[PDB]
Design an enzyme around this catalytic site. Structure first.
Site, mmCIF file in Angstrom:
data_model
loop_
_atom_site.group_PDB
_atom_site.id
_atom_site.type_symbol
_atom_site.label_atom_id
_atom_site.label_comp_id
_atom_site.label_asym_id
_atom_site.label_seq_id
_atom_site.Cartn_x
_atom_site.Cartn_y
_atom_site.Cartn_z
ATOM 1 N N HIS A 95 3.376 1.976 -2.008
ATOM 2 C CA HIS A 95 3.820 2.276 -3.364
ATOM 3 C C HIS A 95 2.975 1.550 -4.405
ATOM 4 C CE1 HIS A 95 7.645 3.235 -1.137
ATOM 5 N NE2 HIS A 95 7.651 4.238 -1.994
ATOM 6 N N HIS A 152 9.029 -8.168 -1.350
ATOM 7 C CA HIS A 152 8.351 -6.918 -1.671
ATOM 8 C C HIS A 152 9.084 -6.212 -2.801
ATOM 9 C CE1 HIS A 152 5.903 -6.553 2.190
ATOM 10 N NE2 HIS A 152 6.668 -7.610 2.391
ATOM 11 N N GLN A 179 2.152 -6.294 5.058
ATOM 12 C CA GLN A 179 2.282 -7.678 5.498
ATOM 13 C C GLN A 179 1.926 -7.890 6.977
ATOM 14 O OE1 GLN A 179 5.765 -9.628 3.974
ATOM 15 N NE2 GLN A 179 5.700 -11.145 5.619
ATOM 16 N N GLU A 194 0.760 -1.262 0.000
ATOM 17 C CA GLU A 194 0.000 0.000 0.000
ATOM 18 C C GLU A 194 0.785 1.303 0.000
ATOM 19 O OE1 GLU A 194 -2.359 -0.741 3.531
ATOM 20 O OE2 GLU A 194 -1.159 0.583 4.747
#
Lengths: 221, 221, 221, 221, 221, 221, 221, 221, 221
Positions: free
Chosen positions: A113, A179, A151, A111
């Protein structure tokens, strides 16, 4: 008629614990169709700001594809109308040991990027009155994964949703993921991976149970 | 004359615990031959409903092949007349440590969709008065695997069968398997695997013994 | 209105070469709903013939689950109404070298016993006038895989379907798969895998091109 | 009535090429039952010559177990009455490329010491008029493997049997195996493995075809 | 003059614990030469009963080869005249921690079918007054391996033999092996392996020492 | 205006513990530009002392490249003006279990010979009031890595910086690395690697937490 | 007296081909001792410009350590007085096939940034009148590696040195390495590796010989 | 009576080609016993020159152990009285393709420093009139390996010995080995390995056959 | 002037514990040059006794090479004049956790047969007042490795040497090695490896510390 008993329960449980995804009530009842078009519109403007020639056949449909992807696919988990149908069978087998579903494929979005999070989840639980269909576990993981996530939150949400549906606090969730927020840009670390775990019931209390689960967590390739 | 002492004992044990596969007594004494033919018939109809041209040489014998597979092969475990012959030797070796048979090939069927369950089982036990023939362990596993299953039940059944035959509660069974019920269809998760364990005697009581077994469970490829 | 231009073309191409799946025209226009119910009924009978207690909560819905799986899932490929939507972009990049999409997940059914076939396909082609969306290749593979197959036919079908849609004979398809028809029953060979390839255009003519493809075929895990 | 058409053909083919296992016609029509008992008797004598206490529960049934294993299991291939049933479907798929069945589990016996040969076979063939059931290939390999062998002969036998049944000389067989004759005793080489290949038709003539097959041969673990 | 002090000790220790291989005293003093010839004779008969053409150059010497293999090689461990010479050096280094010899090559025979057992042994011990030559450990393992065995007994025998020679009960033996009795025939499980351990002294008493050893047990390839 | 609140805090914390890199205050305010030129000058002289022909196009710009690398790249961690921007979100997820970031790419310089240190770091912490952005952890590791280091100090520094920023002593850092100081020259040990860990809070106090972290430390490739 | 016949030959050969490292004749006869001290001085200044507190025990000796490393170790290849002693034996074995020395450990320095180059070389040659000591090949590789290099030049130099010494143009050199110049800084690509090869004689002319070598090049780990 | 026909032939073939190990005729007929004692004596002197306290129980027997190792073990290949017994069977199987024996364990000694050479040999040959016993190949390799060698010669010797015995020039030998002469001392390269091949007949002439062999050469672990 | 303070300390420590290598004081002050020559002479005689033609160019220099290897290389650890220079830095970092240097390349000689021992050592310690240079640990390992050893002693020696130099008893040494004494000759076990550990201070006392170390010991390849 709208949300299933399960979808309602899980949603309430999350809101109660303050673990729900930061959402604002729908300002106005818009058809997903009109939202998609509006999003497509803003995307068209962003692509133009990037100087992309939207006249090109390949780029032409992008704004629409992105809009549909957001509303219908990658962020569909935000709508509880898409909550999976849960099937539970009576624990006649009298299972008292944990059932572990490992290496569940998980694809989410960071959320901060809006970039891909690719990883795997390992879920385990000790059956109380009912046993859940293995596929359902995978589906619940996917549901929450299809949201702008962090996460740390994702893991917590899955845990609670399962505890609520299974009617047992003895649930454990561990997620190991890469990620692209970190790999594809910024510091561009090509090897790091993050692991987050949320333990409920015995999995947190009993060191014996806790370690048995942790020992089973993660595999290779 | 019908069922061996072993087959009878195991069947009773399972019924007592309520862990037997949901079976109804034979409505009428039919020859497996007549059952096969009847099943073949129903399959012929199903294939026709699917619009398959049963005149094709390759599809022609399928209804029969399926019927035989069901009655004689994949579901043969439902008939205790197929229970393996158990050979036990006196534990003159005075073995007091657990004997572990790992990576036992296991192929079963998920009863909710009648689709392949492919995995491996790890069985371990502490010899009391008698030591069982290693092959027999693999055979017992296969027997119970050849039935419409639910991994949670399958694991339980193998445990009890072995406890009964070995005359020791010190038995542990762990099964790790891939369900095509989940992979090949539905959510189509290509990486998840389920692990279920059932522990008896010291393997459940003694944390020391319990972990020694768990630590040995599972390998790679 | 019924079948897309693509679905029609592919179907015709297959029928012309005599490579279509053995199908009989629908005897009567039945709703998939009625077909499912009829199939479910035959399944109910088969299960009863197997002596399964259909009163059990876990087994109760199976006849329906199997029926839906057949009509809607694993055999959906038999209905061209399910053929994917094909997107082709102009080959402005002027690509003259082959594009290879490897390790496509493939799950099919061996029509001789209606048992799982699990494998991976490697598809390659040399772009002529148009480039196809990578995802579409995976989709076409899945479509044909969702049918009672014989690997030899499956490979052929995918080849032709692609050649037709891409408008080039320069297409190559290789499929490596494990047949549970062989592993889970019968001879029970736990290690064998079958590989079948179908080459078109330069992939068959040009030894140079042929080997470049073959060399790229297959990976590990 | 005795031997199937296939069993007869294969046997004749082998005898013609002088590739059959060195057999003498049955001196007298003995029931396998009497043969087993006689063999068991000789084994009883051998064990006694080794000074083994045959009164021990564990050793007691060995002479019989070995006799049955020889006659019914590991040397069953010597009796063509055990030849598998061959199923061939018309090559309507018009397959002109080779079909490769790799990693076929193979267990045989080195006739010079009657010790285990454990290996894997890779068989490939180019379909002419008919396509053989994949399982059948594994079965034929097993048949000839269940005999006192010499890898050089075993590979040849499999090749011929297949050429005969498929009606094509385009067949290739490669076997890679570990001989305990070498490992478990004698020089005790713990790492060596022997690879033998027999090529027919294009696999021997066409260097192109030959290398394509050879390149595919062998995998890992 | 016959048996070494070591051989005698080990033999007595084994007989005392009732862990000796089931042997009957030699009925008559026969030369190994005459025993071999008699065994060869029985083998000739067995091969003839199997209808093997003993006139064939390759099969001709087999009866003799098998007889020599039995008496001189694979079953030589039955004769204590073949017990290795043990060399012990004074523990001047004052070693108080365990010495572990891992992955010792072990090839034995499953006495129930006289088939190959291929595996690896891990032996460890805590030096008391003397340290044994590493090679000697491998030799003792080989000695007891060269006998018709039952893995459960083999492990016990090696343990006792070592305890006796080292003069310490602090010895631990773990054996992991594949039985062709199970793989090559019967159920034909191609993946299972059996692990048996026998722990003496601290390795059984001290959970700390026990686990340190167990954690070290087994490697890969 | 100069250093961020974070940079100042971390710097002070390090100086307080006496864990800062041995630095002397800037003798005179020099532009990084003048420092680079001076360094480049000294390098020019060194290269000349090594008899390198600086007139060669390839070597010509080296003095400058090295100077820039030192000041702007590999030793940029010495200037807190390069400290990363830290983003912290409120721990609304109520995470009470450790978050582990594994396999963080780390490249540093062994200060005793100014030679490469290539390794990977594993960082874990138990969120208190705030959760840190995953990428930030990687960045902080890189920051301190970009300095003439001694792995023992490097590990300590990263630990403290993190504890300070997260406001929790529950932080653990483990670094495994290869020192070319050892491999590329001197003793030239081509296989050794050094592992150093620094544990704070529960990771040092609680043996349970400590081991959970240690067990998670290190992976392969 | 100064340079060996070999050192002289190699040096001349390189100079002739214009493949020697860019060197300027020693401006003045300085003792390596005085050169080291001068370099150490320059390093002291550079470290001070970086603001490092040279008063620290750990950093104190660094300037000297680096100076010694440059002159005596990592750049010792620049002085032919360090050229290894070459031992050649008469090719009485009449070897006409190539001898390959693979995975030669190689550590060099990228001259553009003076950063570590870590890799492995594979050298092969076809013996003519003499065979060289295997170790000597490793030493020659190291010699040229111990210089400010550019992999493209490094490979060429080793090739020529060998051709000269062996008296055969049939030499091939392949070097695969990781440049920290690329990994540790700049673009920081953590996975790339560069492979360069130089082929002489038949290894360049004969496609047969060329590919045999290339096929052998590189291994894993 | 002394040397077998085989030992004689092989020895002559080697001497003819001038590929025999540099040996001088026995100056005087000494018993291996007297030679051992003499060698032991010289070793005693060497050890004393090294200042080793030969009174120590552990070092005391070393001079004798070394002497016996030399004469009876590691250099036993120098005495053709130790040449293995060769068994050949008539090539009735009519094998015309190469038989490959891979990964033959080989341990030899580098004659320049008398240090260990540990490697693996891959031998292949095309059967002409006879097929050799697989174990014999391993034994022949060991024979020549048990001599002060130079890998280039060793490979040549094995080739010739086999060609002579098999009566075919179509033999190929490839040896890959690690020389402790290089690893344990001198340059101490911990990763390099030397590969030498010697090809006879078609393996040298036919590029097709040659590459087929080479492609099969070497495996992993 | 002769031995460094460190060399003297370590030597005394070893002698005190009675862990020094069995050495006799130099009978007479001989130059290493004269010792080498004498050893070379004895080797000449040994080679001649082996019937090696010392006139051969390749064997000619062997006696000298071996003598030099013994005195200057593989047994150089016997002379404390070769003890490495130890560099210690003040533990200002205040490291209280163990520093582990793993996979240290170790090559020694089994004193019972003077054959290669190839292995890897893992050394760990908890810094007290000073931290040692990582390379120094590798050097100390090598020093003691360069002597006629017995792994049990070698491990002890390294432990004590380190404890003495670091001024802490908290040191642990684990060595895993392959003895060619066992592999290349005698029983010729191609897979066994021996592991020995010596634990000091907390590594022996604290079960927590002990296991943390043991768990970290050993890796793969």
């Amino acid at each position: 008629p709208s949300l299933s008993k399960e979808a309602a329960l899980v949603h309430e449980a999350l809101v109660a614990r303050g673990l729900e995804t930061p959402l604002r009530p729908p300002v106005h009842e818009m058809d997903n169709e009109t939202r998609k078009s509006l999003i497509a519109g803003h995307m068209t403007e962003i692509m133009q700001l990037l100087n992309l020639d939207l006249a090109d056949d390949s780029l032409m449909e992008t704004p629409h594809r992105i809009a549909k992807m957001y509303v219908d696919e990658i962020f569909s988990g935000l709508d509880y109308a898409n909550f999976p149908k849960i099937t539970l069978i009576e624990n006649k087998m009298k299972v008292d040991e944990m059932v572990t579903v490992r290496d569940i494929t998980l694809t989410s979005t960071c959320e901060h990027h809006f970039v891909t999070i690719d990883g795997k989840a390992t879920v385990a639980y000790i059956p109380k009155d009912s046993v859940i269909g293995l596929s359902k576990i995978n589906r619940i993981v996917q549901f929450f994964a299809q949201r702008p996530q962090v996460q740390e939150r994702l893991t917590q949400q899955i845990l609670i949703a399962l505890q609520t549906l299974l009617g047992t606090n003895n649930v454990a969730v561990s997620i190991d993921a890469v990620h692209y927020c970190v790999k594809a840009r910024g510091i561009r670390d090509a090897t790091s991976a993050t692991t987050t775990t949320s333990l409920g019931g015995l999995f947190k209390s009993s060191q014996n149970t806790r370690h048995e689960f942790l020992r089973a967590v993660r595999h290779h390739n």
